[PDB]
Design a binder for these strands. Structure first.
Ligand SMILES: [Mg+2]
Ligand SMILES: [Mg+2]
Ligand SMILES: [Zn+2]
Ligand SMILES: [Zn+2]
Ligand SMILES: [Zn+2]
Length: 157
RNA sequence: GUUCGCGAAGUAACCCUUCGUGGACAUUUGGUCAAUUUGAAACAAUACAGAGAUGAUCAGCAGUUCCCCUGCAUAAGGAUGAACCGUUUUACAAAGAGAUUUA
């Protein structure tokens, strides 16, 4: 029941046909992303992986707004879309929290993985990174987060 | 972006939107590493040389070196694995004899 339809898979509920054209359009953008473009550069190669983290994030904001913001789908369709692995359950669970409404991924708040026990730089608000920049006179030595290619996922931002 | 409070607007049995404000929430990724010739795989082929002792042909096993390869290996193999089988003058005098030689 995660991804391919088997006999143990339950039939889809009512509102799935109206959301299915957008979910098919995310699905074919991942297939172009999965394939290897033969890239010599190390900086181009993780740039391809950032497209996968973004395409994953956007399809989960799609199902999140349909149920928690617009209420356009029944809960029986939402429980089906979680079990059939359309929407990332643990990512939606942070989006419900306060301060985490626009979080890019779960790997960027995971403190144990960092050298310093900190969050990712993409979690720091753009007002604050501009401030110590004014101390130095140099703008920003930060463009994209190494694990996501996130330009800053903070709430105020 | 959410939420709490505040100040207004319009709708208004004070409710719904919208604008202006205070506080809260959330807080510093990654690299010892840049994408062909100029910071360092190897082999095969070719050319030369030829794989111990001995009168001669052979089983080998060691030790020594700022020598290794194969192997999980403290096993066993790798020409008995390889390189060593070259060069070597003073802790130095005692005894005597001749000759030279000087107060
Ligand atoms: Mg030997
Ligand atoms: Mg041997
Ligand atoms: Zn992230
Ligand atoms: Zn990040
Ligand atoms: Zn981020």
């Amino acid at each position: 029941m995660p991804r391919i339809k088997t006999r143990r898979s339950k039939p889809a509920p009512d509102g799935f046909e109206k959301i299915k054209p957008t979910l098919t359009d995310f699905e074919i953008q991942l297939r172009d992303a999965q394939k290897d473009k033969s890239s010599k550069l190390a900086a181009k190669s993780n740039e391809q992986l950032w497209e996968i983290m973004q395409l994953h994030h956007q399809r989960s904001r799609y199902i999140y707004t349909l149920y928690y913001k617009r209420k356009a789908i029944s809960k029986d369709l939402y429980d089906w879309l979680i079990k059939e692995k359309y929407a990332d359950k643990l990512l939606i669970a942070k989006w419900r929290k306060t301060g985490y409404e626009k979080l890019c991924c779960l790997r960027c708040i995971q403190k144990n993985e960092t050298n310093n026990g900190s969050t990712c730089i993409c979690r720091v608000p753009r007002a604050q990174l501009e401030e110590e920049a004014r101390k130095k006179g140099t703008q920003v030595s930060f463009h994209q987060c190494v694990h996501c290619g996130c330009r800053g996922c903070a709430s105020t931002d």
